[PDB]
Amino acid sequence: NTNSNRYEGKVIDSAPLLPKMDFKSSPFRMYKVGTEFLVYDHNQYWYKTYIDDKLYYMYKSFCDVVAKKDAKGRIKVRIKSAKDLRIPVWNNIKLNSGKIKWYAPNVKLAWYNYRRGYLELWYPNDGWYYTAEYFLK
User: Fold this and answer.
1) Residue-wise DSSP of the chain
2) Rg of the chain's alpha carbons, rounded to an integer?
3) Nearest by Cα to 35 from 72, 73, 71, 62
């Protein structure tokens, strides 16, 4: 009777390098806390960088600015440490805006993976909340 789709884990200590400005996309890489890399300023929320002549995006609130821009305009950023990193959990399956619960890494959570493309977290007072499949392990 054991629920094979029910999992018990914790919040990851990495930030996704997404191919699009969408958390529901498959990340190209997962950047551990404290990882340093160069990005450009794309818009209000997202950074951008080029790998193999391909554009990947990174959420700004996951990074720390540690240096001034270079001659190319690249910002040397660093993924926030586990003390400061905050991982989102949306109230909608679209994983965009709405209500968001922000979790620090290593915080224990129980979710459900029913192949919907996202994780499902039940809250006794708030109902169903969702996050990305890579955010909880």
Assistant:
1) ---TTEEEEEB-SEEEEBSSS-TTSPPSEEEETT-EEEEEE-SSSEEEEEETTEEEEEEGGGEEE-S---TT--EEEEEPPTTT--EEEESSTT-SSS-EEEE-TT-EEEEE--SSSSEEEEETTTEEEEE-TTTB-
2) 16
3) 62
CA angle (94, 13, 58) in 5-degree steps: 50
Q: What is the experimental method?
A: X-ray
Structure's resolution in angstroms:
1.6
Q: Are 114 and 126 in contact (CB under 8 A)?
A: no
Cβ-based neighbours of 112, under 8 Å, separated by 6 or more: 3, 5, 6, 7, 119, 120, 121, 122
Tokens representing residue 135 in the block: 């955010």
Short-list 135, 98, 88, CA closest to 113: 135
Domains of the chain, earliest start first: 1-12+85-137 (2.30.30.40), 13-84 (2.30.30.40)
